[PDB]
Amino acid sequence: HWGYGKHNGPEHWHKDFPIAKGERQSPVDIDTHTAKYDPSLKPLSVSYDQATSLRILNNGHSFKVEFDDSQDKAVLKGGPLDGTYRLTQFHFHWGSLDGQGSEHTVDKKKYAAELHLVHWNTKYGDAGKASQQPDGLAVLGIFLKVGSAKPGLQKVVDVLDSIKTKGKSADFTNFDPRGLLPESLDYWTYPGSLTTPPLNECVTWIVLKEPISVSSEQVLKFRKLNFNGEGEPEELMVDNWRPAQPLKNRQIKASFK
Numbered sequence: 001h002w003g004y005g006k007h008n009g010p011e012h013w014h015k016d017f018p019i020a021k022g023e024r025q026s027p028v029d030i031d032t033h034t035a036k037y038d039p040s041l042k043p044l045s046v047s048y049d050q051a052t053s054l055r056i057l058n059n060g061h062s063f064k065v066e067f068d069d070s071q072d073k074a075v076l077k078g079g080p081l082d083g084t085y086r087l088t089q090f091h092f093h094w095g096s097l098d099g100q101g102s103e104h105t106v107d108k109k110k111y112a113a114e115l116h117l118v119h120w121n122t123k124y125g126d127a128g129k130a131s132q133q134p135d136g137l138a139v140l141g142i143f144l145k146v147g148s149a150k151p152g153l154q155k156v157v158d159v160l161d162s163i164k165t166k167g168k169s170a171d172f173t174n175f176d177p178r179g180l181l182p183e184s185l186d187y188w189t190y191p192g193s194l195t196t197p198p199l200n201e202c203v204t205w206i207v208l209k210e211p212i213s214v215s216s217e218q219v220l221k222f223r224k225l226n227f228n229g230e231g232e233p234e235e236l237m238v239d240n241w242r243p244a245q246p247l248k249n250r251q252i253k254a255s256f257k
């Protein structure tokens, strides 16, 4: 029943999910001047060569591309992480206009959108179980700015007209998420939470410093999606971002100087 609107959006979520007011909620503003360079952090290992995309779905909040995560096929390790995290899905958050849409901010700057690649720690066996653990998930966050097109995104944007309204899905195989990554894997990292209900405090966030560029046409297709189900009043799926939450005692670490 939650969403992003005036009566059911982020300021209301604490009533159903009191963890919304917890000590490690996400997203956050990344103050780049107070982030601590940690020379002991590892390079992030992203191993997406054998990834198997399966389907794309409009769930009424975002859209999400789900992967075969029953094998060790698309894994994140290294960086701040201990052990192996398997990719289960990615999704995006975006704005009604180019000056907003990201969840994280950088020195208060909002990006047009943010891509989240969600991974779960294999020591917990399954994504639901992992979501109940303090080190259960690792989410790789990538900012999107509007400028030149990202050719690797086009396969995603071109099927969005088939999943316009809540509950629609389609097969979506052979999508390579490597085509969504920027050149650099320099990153900030901090302990946080899911940014949607149930808001569990189970995420190690890894947010890349380098944005990708996407074109105005690509992001316009995101904005044609609908929050509503077919046959309810039309509400365009825009501004599906949670604003920055208090950092509380946490340190953000940088992998770079």
Ligand SMILES: NS(=O)(=O)c1c(F)c(F)c(S(=O)(=O)CCO)c(NC2CCCCCCC2)c1F
Pocket: 059, 061, 062, 064, 088, 091, 116, 118, 120, 127, 128, 131, 139, 193, 194, 195, 196, 197, 198, 199
């Ligand atoms: N931003 S985020 O990465 O914290 C996020 C979402 F915004 C999001 F919408 C989803 S969702 O569509 O699946 C809706 C429920 O929050 C997940 N998904 C993860 C969290 C759900 C629990 C199971 C663990 C892996 C999926 C999710 F991780």
Ligand SMILES: [Zn+2]
Pocket: 091, 092, 093, 116, 195
């Ligand atoms: Zn997200």
